[PDB]
Amino acid sequence: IKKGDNVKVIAGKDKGKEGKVIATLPKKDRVVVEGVNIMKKHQGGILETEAAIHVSNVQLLDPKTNEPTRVGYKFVRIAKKSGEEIK
RNA sequence: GCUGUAAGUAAGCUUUGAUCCAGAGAUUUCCGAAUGGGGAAACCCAGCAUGAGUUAUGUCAUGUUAUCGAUAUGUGAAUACAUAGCAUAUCAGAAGGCACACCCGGAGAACUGAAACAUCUUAGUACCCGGAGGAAGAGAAAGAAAAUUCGAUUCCCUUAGUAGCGGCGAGCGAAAUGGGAAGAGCCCAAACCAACAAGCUUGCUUGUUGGGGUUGUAGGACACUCUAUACGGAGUUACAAAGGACGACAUUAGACGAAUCAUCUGGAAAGAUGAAUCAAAGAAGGUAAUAAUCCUGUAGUCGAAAAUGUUGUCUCUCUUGAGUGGAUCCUGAGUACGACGGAGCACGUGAAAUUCCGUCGGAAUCUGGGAGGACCAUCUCCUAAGGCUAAAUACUCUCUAGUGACCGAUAGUGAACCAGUACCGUGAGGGAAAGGUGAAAAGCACCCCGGAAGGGGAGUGAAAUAGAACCUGAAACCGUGUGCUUACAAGUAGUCAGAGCCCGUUAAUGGGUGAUGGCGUGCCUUUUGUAGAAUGAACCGGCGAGUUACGAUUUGAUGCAAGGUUA
RNA sequence: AGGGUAGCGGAGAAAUUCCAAUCGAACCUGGAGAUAGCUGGUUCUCUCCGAAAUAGCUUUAGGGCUAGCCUCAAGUGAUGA
RNA sequence: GACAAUGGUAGGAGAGCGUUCUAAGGGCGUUGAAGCAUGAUCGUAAGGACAUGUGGAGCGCUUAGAAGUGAGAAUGCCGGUGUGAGUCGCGAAAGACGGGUGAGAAUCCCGUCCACCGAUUGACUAAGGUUUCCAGAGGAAGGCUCGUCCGCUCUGGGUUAGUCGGGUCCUAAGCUGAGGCCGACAGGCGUAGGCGAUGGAUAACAGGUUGAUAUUCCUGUACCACCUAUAAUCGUUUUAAUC
RNA sequence: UAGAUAGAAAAUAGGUGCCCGUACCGCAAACCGACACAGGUAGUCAAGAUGAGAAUUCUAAGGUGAGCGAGCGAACUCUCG
RNA sequence: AGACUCGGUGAAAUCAUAGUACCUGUGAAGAUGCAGGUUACCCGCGACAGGACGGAAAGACCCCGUGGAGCUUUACUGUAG
Ligand SMILES: [Mg+2]
Ligand SMILES: [Mg+2]
Ligand SMILES: [Mg+2]
Ligand SMILES: [Mg+2]
Ligand SMILES: [Mg+2]
Ligand SMILES: [Mg+2]
Ligand SMILES: [Mg+2]
Ligand SMILES: [Mg+2]
Ligand SMILES: [Mg+2]
Ligand SMILES: [Mg+2]
Ligand SMILES: [Mg+2]
Ligand SMILES: [Mg+2]
Ligand SMILES: [Mg+2]
Ligand SMILES: [Mg+2]
Ligand SMILES: [Mg+2]
Ligand SMILES: [O]
Ligand SMILES: [O]
Ligand SMILES: [O]
What we know:
By secondary structure, the chain is an all-beta fold.
């Protein structure tokens, strides 16, 4: 439900980090974001592409802090905890 | 975001709202009841009309073409009449399929039990056939019963394994009174009238509609008195007559949907440590390890353009309802009943009622007839010989939502995976084995030997002795090395004693080996008795055999007590 | 080569021979977990007690029933040896 | 503290251990669960703890309840592994040499010789099987050895008809069979007609050609039916030409 | 012949001509026989010398060398002289 | 030709554990496994075949079963016709 906005990945390899997302993959439920870099290899010794994680993620717009995203009233449109700006 | 499982590549689509979800609609090749003919199922061959293309034939497109019946036609003649037949047209008719379930009907067995068996039982079960339903059957008293009588049917309890049937053996087995679930009663036939009809006896009667009328405490007709009036009404489309309008509710896609931060460990926290929060939501599952406060979610609330289903009110239809009197008529005929053979009723021919079947005989008409377990009498009750009928009930191929002191890959569906498959058989038919990498594919770049395969290295990853025949990885079985020991030796193979050599524990009367001596004929089963040359086991792993309901009986406990107890 | 007859049956130059490698009555499914007085098998330890192989009847003698002989819990109460 | 008993099958009575699950309570667990393995330990027994290694996520304990509750033996079912055994066999048969290939050849290709069948181990078709056919690669298993090869795998590719066998022609045996006769239902019989060839009738030959097709392709030469176009014969639509 | 129907077409030119099957083995390695199995598997052609002859012996056409072999040359079994 | 040695490939019915003598005796009354004596260094390979009451086939003979089928008849009871 996300198309390249901000997040804070909290509960994975290394946390406290943020970044912006690529394909959400609705079926596998796995998003692509800067924060994991597999050492893939083809015939280079390594490749350093970008890999995915399950949704252990959260958004942050006004508080500059993770909150439970909360799609609220119809004006649909997002309406977060403390502040209500677009997703 | 998408182009299924099923990767991958390339081409492309998508806020001008894809894909996806739900409802309607359009298409829906061929076989198959198969239906134009034929046919080895999925092929072939035609016909007629119309219409494509040819100069023209060949060739094609669409439509149409079976049988049966049941209506309307014409036509029919072996015989003149006119029927049998014949050609044509109409029908949303039927045929078939199935859920091996539940129901009714036709037909209908044997092993077995009886300690054998023929009566009998199993059983009126199985399978077969047929029909219909979503439920069926039954059904509104020619009952039950014996009183302060009740007044369709069905099912559950109970009466009762009682009364009874029975080579009186096996065994079989009610019904009623009573307590409950559901509760519903109605139309014909007939005598009477009108109409039309052939015989018109110019007598009226039969033939067809409409009325008319539906019963035991007798009723209707017929005669008479009032109600109603084309309606005051009851209507009730689930019987009772068969048609149609218009609101509410549920279903088939969905949405909202409160709440948490940090330190340590970690590859990774959802854990420990602390301090905080929501609760109509601490159900559940997933999330790199065990989460109410990360996601999906739940409590609760909202929501349907269209379609369906059930319900409601006006339309809608359709309808007279009682009473008396009973002069005269009517109350279901080759029926009821009897005998003869049989079946079925719990009931085997028994004294055997009551009900059905076949042959044959053969009643009555309300001052009538049937029953009340042979049969007659009195008494009591009911009125066949015509028909319809919801619910209560039985089952679940299937769907929705749920659940389990149910299984967790030799269990459980046979089937967790590409299974009614491979396979076997001519064929009916029978029938397999086979789950798991990791959190994520990050699925081993690169070097080296090698023809390859395979491997050693290097790297991804916490771990690759997790590397695809990939979690864990036992035992059999096979090896490699090694401490001790073994080449004059008669061995169910061990045990007891014990020197020598070596080693040091879940640290105690230690452990490994064992020159030599004493002693000693496996295990179960079955047996008068077995080393047994009587049987079975090749080894090891798994699997695998006194269970459950109902009832009787006793034992122990427990509660009550001349009372106790519920279905 | 194409066809027929099908098991309470058929066909048989007849032997109880053939009927999809089987025939003193084929084959598959269902009744059906048929029946068996017969054989075989019956899973984890200890403690206490402890037999019989006889009588009778049995279309019975390798089975059964009753009495004997055992065990357990009550009762009797010195009756037993 | 004394006294006495304590072998034991069928079998009777009694007390007991552990597994799976449930309920409740209380606890353990990445600072490594379960299981597994090793061990010189506890208990009278069935059995249970402990330490260590491997293992990588759930488990114990007390009380009680319900059980698909225990397996050495069924000529038991299934699975795996041996024993026999590197033992019998390797499925009639005459091959040898050279040269190539290849990582590697008694077995593969090439040739020369030799031997064998020859009313045939030859050539052609039917039934039958279903792509085995041909080319190019490959050798994991199959081939009763080896294999650089195949009828095995992978990729690609191959079957041409107016005259041929057959259908649009016929029919027996037999099968089906409108109406119809019969039967408890099912269904059984059977006329009309219809299907059904191994038979009857039916218009074609020779050569060439591909790694793989041949009366099918081309090359030449022929035939039957049919339509269209064209004319030398007909003359009531009779009869005559004519169907 | 009943019947159709105005009234042909000699030989000429031109064209039109459907479905199935067709590969391969087919006394075999490919069919039935569970096997790349010493079995069966209808039919057609079937040459040469010798011979009555499709018999027999040896050869054409053409096809094959049989899917384990090398040693030694004992028992024993089998096949032949 | 097989067997036999070497190379290649590589099964099976069976199988309680085994380091598996003989005699005379005992014994379920015919012993590798017991008692008493006797002889025998450990391990092979090729041959024979007395024993392993050897294997294979839950004895085809005999008997039992209140087992079963087929068949006969002036056995019973019934029946189609
Ligand atoms: Mg219809
Ligand atoms: Mg009678
Ligand atoms: Mg009668
Ligand atoms: Mg398992
Ligand atoms: Mg035992
Ligand atoms: Mg004896
Ligand atoms: Mg004969
Ligand atoms: Mg049985
Ligand atoms: Mg007794
Ligand atoms: Mg075992
Ligand atoms: Mg050579
Ligand atoms: Mg063919
Ligand atoms: Mg052959
Ligand atoms: Mg000759
Ligand atoms: Mg050898
Ligand atoms: O059985
Ligand atoms: O059985
Ligand atoms: O049985």
